[PDB]
Amino acid sequence: GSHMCDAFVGTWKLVSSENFDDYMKEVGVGFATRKVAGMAKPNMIISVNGDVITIKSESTFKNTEISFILGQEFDEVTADDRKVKSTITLDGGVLVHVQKWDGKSTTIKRKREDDKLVVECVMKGVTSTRVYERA
Ligand SMILES: O=C(O)c1cc(C2CCCCC2)c(OCC(F)(F)F)nc1C(F)(F)F
């Protein structure tokens, strides 16, 4: 029945963001998309069905959905319209999401901390932290 990844399941709303604009610059997002994407207040809906995890983000800018099995690479179109190759694993209770494209890489870690879901993103040393709470 239950799995350790069940502490991520639910509906989550963004409550704070730090340095996201700079992270998006590093990733290569252009001005207009950065401004509109940075303005978004996404909710994230995380569900599990068997081995398949689904993460949906809903906002006024774009809605995105990925479904995956841990440790099994998939192709993803990101909200900023990159086409990337992604792998997501669980490493000591942290969901680790690596995206690779055009010889570049970025890592997005998701962890439960108290009542929050904390998202830490890094690209070439540029960092962002986004904090979600249950909706
Ligand atoms: O989870 C997040 O809050 C998050 C959210 C977004 C989107 C979701 C839809 C509305 C606009 C922002 C995102 O987009 C990708 C890029 F940032 F590159 F534009 N990246 C991340 C993150 F990097 F942190 F995983």
- Residue located via tokens 């998006």: 24
131 is annotated as contributing to ligand binding: yes
From 95, 99, 105, 113, select the one nearest 46 (Cα to Cα).
95
Using CB atoms within 10 Å of the CB of residue 45, give its burial: 0 to 12 exposed, 13 to 18 middle, 19+ buried. middle
Coil, helix or strand for 21? Answer: helix
Sign of CA dihedral 29, 32, 35, 38: negative
In b/e form, how buried is each residue of 90-107, taking b as 16+ CB within 10 angstroms? beeeebbbbbebeeeebe
In this structure, which CATH number among 1.20.810.10, 2.40.128.20, 3.30.70.260, 3.10.580.10 belongs to the domain 10-134? 2.40.128.20
Q: Reported resolution in A?
A: 1.1
Dist CA 102 CA 28 (whole Å): 11
Pocket of ligand 1 (CB under 6 A): 24, 27, 29, 37, 40, 42, 57, 59, 61-62, 64, 78-80, 108, 119, 121, 130
Output the CA angle 4-8-12, nearest 5 degrees. 170
From 79, 87, 96, select the one nearest 27 (Cα to Cα).
79
* Domain spans of the chain, in order of start: 10-134
